[PDB]
Amino acid sequence: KLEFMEMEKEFEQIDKSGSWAAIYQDIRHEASDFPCRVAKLPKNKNRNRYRDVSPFDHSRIKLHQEDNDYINASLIKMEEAQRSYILTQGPLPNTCGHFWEMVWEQKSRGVVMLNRVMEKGSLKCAQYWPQKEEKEMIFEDTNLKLTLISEDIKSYYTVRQLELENLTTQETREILHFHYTTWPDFGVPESPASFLNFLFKVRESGSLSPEHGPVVVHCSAGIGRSGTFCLADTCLLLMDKRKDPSSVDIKKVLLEMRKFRMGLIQTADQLRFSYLAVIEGAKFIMGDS
Ligand SMILES: O=P(O)(O)C(F)(F)c1ccc(C[C@](C/C=C/c2ccccc2)(c2nc3ccccc3s2)n2nnc3ccccc32)cc1
Ligand SMILES: [Cl-]
Numbered sequence: 001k002l003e004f005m006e007m008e009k010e011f012e013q014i015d016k017s018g019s020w021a022a023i024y025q026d027i028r029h030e031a032s033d034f035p036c037r038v039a040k041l042p043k044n045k046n047r048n049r050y051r052d053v054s055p056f057d058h059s060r061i062k063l064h065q066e067d068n069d070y071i072n073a074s075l076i077k078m079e080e081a082q083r084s085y086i087l088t089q090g091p092l093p094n095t096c097g098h099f100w101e102m103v104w105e106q107k108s109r110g111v112v113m114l115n116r117v118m119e120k121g122s123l124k125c126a127q128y129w130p131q132k133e134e135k136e137m138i139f140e141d142t143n144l145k146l147t148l149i150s151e152d153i154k155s156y157y158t159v160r161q162l163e164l165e166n167l168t169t170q171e172t173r174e175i176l177h178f179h180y181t182t183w184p185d186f187g188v189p190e191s192p193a194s195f196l197n198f199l200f201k202v203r204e205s206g207s208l209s210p211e212h213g214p215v216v217v218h219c220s221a222g223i224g225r226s227g228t229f230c231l232a233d234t235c236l237l238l239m240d241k242r243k244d245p246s247s248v249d250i251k252k253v254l255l256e257m258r259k260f261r262m263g264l265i266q267t268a269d270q271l272r273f274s275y276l277a278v279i280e281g282a283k284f285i286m287g288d289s
């Protein structure tokens with residue numbers, strides 16, 4: 001039971017010997033490399049937010065439109081944890097229709113956003129959901145209508161209830177939007193407690209349930225913060241599932257996730273944070289209060 005003490009120790013040992021940089025560099029070296037031919041096609045250039053961040057061909061989400069099926073989004077499938085996630089970039093001004101089309105086609109019920117909206121330079125993201133109930137959004141290219149139904153705003157995150165309507169069939173669905181608002185570019189969450197609270201709220205909602213399509217997770221590039229978020233959730237799952245939570249190899253789980261999308265987790269501090277968050281999360285879950 002109190003074996004979590006050994007975990008905290010091993011963590012302190014990595015901290016003390018300054019090995020976060022070593023583990024993270026080894027991950028970068030060992031990380032899978034696969035082709036991204038579709039992402040690089042000339043016609044897809046304006047569908048990519050960043051020159052060097054591309055989805056691998058084998059795991060990319062395809063849009064069900066005969067024209068151009070390309071979206072910068074990847075399906076991460078974690079077999080043992082039995083969870084799936086779609087990681088994508090902050091939508092661009094011309095890919096908001098594609099983003100919601102993917103949300104529709106894949107049957108996701110939740111969207112997790114970890115960045116903030118479109119600055120007046122770089123490292124931005126278009127305003128892809130309505131800010132007011134009466135100002136709904138219609139994506140003509142993909143024939144979808146998006147309406148803001150309600151919004152619960154908190155200190156570090158906001159949860160929104162949206163209605164997504166396929167204008168062709170007039171069928172409508174409820175999408176939950178979980179927006180963590182205080183996670184800086186290449187930074188870490190305010191604290192493990194805040195992150196964990198956010199994560200638990202996403203879990204509690206059922207958006208991560210195998211009954212729905214996979215949750216769509218995004219930040220700006222769809223790799224640093226998105227990678228930190230999913231890595232933490234998946235490691236928590238494995239620790240609860242398995243008999244020995246100490247047997248969970250975070251580094252290894254991250255390398256596994258990297259087979260599906262490049263660059264997941266962008267700094268050694270984010271790697272460290274994911275370890276902290278998982279250890280803390282495992283205590284609260286394997287706890288009683
Ligand atoms: O949490 P996230 O995922 O949103 C993030 F903040 F970590 C993030 C933001 C931006 C980028 C793209 C990158 C960095 C990509 C890194 C990368 C790519 C492939 C694999 C692994 C890592 C950046 N773009 C900008 C723009 C303004 C300021 C700072 C940056 S860093 N980039 N992409 N193409 C480039 C061509 C030339 C230079 C940088 C390039 C990657 C990751
Ligand atoms: Cl990297």
Ligand SMILES: [Mg+2]
Pocket residue numbers: 058059
């Ligand atoms: Mg395949």
Ligand SMILES: [Mg+2]
Pocket residue numbers: none
């Ligand atoms: Mg209606």
